[PDB]
A paper describes a structure:
DNA sequencing of the output from this selection revealed a distant clone (clone 18-19) that differed from the consensus sequence at 15 out of 80 positions and bound ATP with far greater affinity and specificity than all other clones from that round of selection. The X-ray crystal structure for protein 18-19 was originally solved by Lo Surdo et al. and found to adopt a novel zinc-nucleated α/β-fold not yet observed by nature. The fold is characterized by an α-helix (residues 6–20), followed by an extended loop, then two short β-strands (residues 33–36 and 39–43), followed by a second α-helix (residues 46–56) that leads to another extended loop which terminates in a third β-strand (residues 64–68). A zinc metal ion is bound by tetrahedral coordination to four invariant cysteine residues at positions 23, 26, 46, and 49.
Protein 18-19 was the highest affinity clone isolated from round 18. Unlike many naturally occurring proteins, protein 18-19 requires high concentrations of free ligand in order to remain stably folded and soluble. We determined the X-ray crystal structures of protein 18-19 and the evolutionarily optimized variant, protein DX, to resolution limits of 2.8 Å and 1.65 Å, respectively. The structure of protein 18-19 was solved from the anomalous X-ray scattering of a zinc ion bound to the protein using multiwavelength anomalous dispersion (MAD) methods. The Cα backbone trace of proteins 18-19 and DX can be superimposed with a root mean square deviation (r.m.s.d.) of 0.51 Å from residues 7 to 71. Experiments performed in the absence of ATP showed that protein 18-19 forms an insoluble precipitate after 3 days, while proteins containing one or both of the selected mutations remain soluble after 7 days. Small differences in the relative positioning of the ATP molecules in the two protein structures cannot be resolved due to the limiting resolution of the 18-19 structure.
Author numbering:
A (entry chain A), B (entry chain A): 9 to 71
């Protein structure tokens, strides 16, 4: 059930910048990192000079 | 925001056995463990001989 909760929280938090697309993520190690923004908004953030929305949280994948 | 998510998931999952009371939990280390059952149902499970509902998940408290 932890895995279904991770999935549920991933599906209810859209990108903070565009409010439509899902967030980017990576499986680092044995942690899942959910970044604040989709990939397209993150790259845009780099081009326009804004980093106010950079960030992420980590969730581990056991139990 | 991770902390508000942990709180949200704790508030939406009641005890698996009695379906009313919130689950028991402990802060082990720097992990939060949410057990499957309230304390009163867990102790009952020990007295009646059923362990079908024993278990828990772990959530870390960073990011
Ligand atoms: N898609 C994204 N949305 C928001 N923040 C991001 C995104 N991608 C990268 N970042 C930011 O980049 C920084 C770290 O990059 P990352 O590759 O996660 O870690 P590492 O330092 O291991 O490469 C963090 O502050 C992270 O929030
Ligand atoms: N309230 C509860 N609800 C469900 N399972 C429980 C509960 N309390 C203890 N358990 C079970 O007891 C076992 C481990 O006990 P616990 O104290 O969490 O770990 P430790 O082995 O570090 O003492 C686990 O299988 C756990 O699910
Ligand atoms: Cl977690
Ligand atoms: Zn976006
Ligand atoms: Zn109960």
């Amino acid at each position: 059930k932890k895995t279904n909760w991770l999935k549920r929280i991933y599906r209810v938090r859209p990108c903070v910048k565009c409010k439509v697309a899902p967030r980017n993520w990576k499986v680092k190690n044995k942690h899942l990192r959910i970044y604040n923004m989709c990939k397209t908004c993150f790259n845009n953030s780099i081009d326009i000079g804004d980093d106010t929305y950079h960030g992420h949280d980590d969730w581990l994948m056991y139990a």
